[PDB]
Write a protein that binds this ligand. Structure first.
Ligand SMILES: OC[C@H]1O[C@H](O[C@H]2[C@H](O)[C@@H](O)[C@@H](O[C@H]3[C@H](O)[C@@H](O)[C@@H](O)O[C@@H]3CO)O[C@@H]2CO)[C@H](O)[C@@H](O)[C@@H]1O
Length: 383
């Protein structure tokens, strides 16, 4: 009598056309562990949605699931993710950088197995921009069409971080709260107002389907997005036209300021409600193993986090893995694991309010007001 293990991950990992990585690796796990009598059932869900899916009812959720690490604290508070020990915890510490192990560490305990870094970067049309052009957003706007998903807080912050706005201090001090206040914040809001007023800027939609469509028809030539859409970007542009870069500067008041993406991880978590914790924990370890990460790279081009794969020649030569590494070293801030729910929620209507014709449109005349309103809402969400 087989036991059913229910595993949740994104559509791309369950798509046979992309090698169905998650199924492939679950089957490899079973073959490696003949003492287990198991079969698999799969739930399709983006890592970006795992908080909502699992915390609503953990007992109803998958046994093993793929999530984005900023969801860690709400998963813990919902009793929805198991502490990991033993060889699994040791692997997470030994095989990752300190920053990557920290992405899944809460109060000194490991709660998940990283399988890739989680950040974003620039895709661009090499027929439109040069390598030098894409160093500066301002230069780019003089040459071609630029998009950005401003109603997605995971992207929005890069602009505010560029001018010294902070989330929980360095990201780890809850008592510091949010600081988007003052002239430093208004200057960024003003830059974004000017960006929306630029006829070569096109706002991307929240999950980036607009940008992808624009790359294809030529109405957008630069796309800020991530590794998961690498194959779709190659389809849209044609592979010989795909440029991949780290983040540009923006010129605020004559000063070049560096856009800084969040850098976290995507990881495999174990549901405490799973009836076979031994199997679930070993499966999580397997899905984040070196072999499994290499397969993720070969099957659908996802960059590994395991540092022993950093010296793989194919990985080192890959333009997305390279850009992600550059974003890590030069263009990022560590993703807070202090819950940012209030920020994700507030960011979306704030970003939407830059649009021409929007209700309560953010303009030069009200930029300071709207900036303080945002800062106030963020800090109110902590009370
Ligand atoms: O927008 C708020 C949202 O921001 C974060 O979500 C981002 C993910 O962390 C990031 O990995 C990426 O999600 C993609 C998956 O990685 C990918 O496998 C596939 O499923 O597409 C997803 C994008 O559609 O982008 C999202 C932001 O769009 C944060 O983790 C969330 O908790 C937060 O709600």
């Amino acid at each position: 009598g087989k036991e059913t293990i229910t595993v949740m991950g994104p559509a791309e990992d369950l798509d046979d056309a992309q090698g169905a990585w998650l199924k492939t690796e679950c089957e490899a796990f079973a073959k490696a562990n003949p003492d287990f009598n198991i079969e698999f059932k799969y739930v399709t869900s983006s890592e970006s949605d795992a908080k909502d899916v699992v915390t609503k009812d953990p007992k109803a959720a998958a046994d093993v699931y793929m999530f984005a690490n900023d969801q860690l604290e709400p998963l813990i508070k919902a009793n929805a993710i198991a502490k990991l020990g033993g060889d699994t915890a040791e692997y997470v510490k030994s095989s990752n950088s300190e920053a990557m192990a920290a992405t899944v560490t809460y109060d000194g305990d490991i709660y998940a197995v990283p399988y890739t870094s989680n950040t974003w970067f620039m895709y661009y049309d090499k027929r439109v921009f040069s390598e030098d052009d894409v160093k500066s957003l301002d230069t780019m706007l003089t040459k071609g069409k630029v998009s950005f998903p401003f109603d997605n807080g995971w992207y929005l912050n890069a602009f505010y971080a560029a001018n010294g706005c902070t989330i929980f201090g360095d990201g780890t001090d809850k008592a510091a709260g949010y600081d988007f206040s003052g002239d430093k914040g208004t200057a960024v809001t003003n830059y974004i107002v000017d960006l929306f007023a630029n006829p070569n800027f096109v706002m991307d939609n929240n999950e980036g389907s607009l940008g992808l469509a624009g790359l294809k028809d030529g109405s957008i030539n630069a796309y800020f997005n991530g590794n998961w859409n690498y194959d779709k970007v190659k389809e849209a542009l044609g592979e010989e036209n795909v440029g991949v870069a780290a983040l540009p500067t923006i010129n605020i008041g004559g000063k070049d300021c560096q856009l800084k993406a969040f850098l976290g991880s995507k990881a495999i978590g174990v549901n405490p409600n799973c009836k076979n914790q031994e199997v679930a924990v070993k499966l999580a370890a397997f899905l984040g193993s070196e072999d499994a990460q290499l397969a993720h790279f070969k099957l659908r081009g996802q960059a590994p986090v395991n540092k022993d794969l950093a010296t793989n020649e194919e990985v080192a030569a890959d333009p997305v893995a390279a850009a992600m590494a550059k974003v890590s070293s030069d263009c990022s801030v560590a993703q807070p694991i202090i819950d940012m729910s209030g920020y994700w929620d507030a960011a979306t209507p704030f970003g939407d309010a830059f649009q021409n014709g929007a209700e309560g449109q953010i303009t030069k005349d009200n930029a300071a007001q709207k900036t303080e309103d945002f800062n106030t809402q963020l800090n109110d969400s902590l009370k």
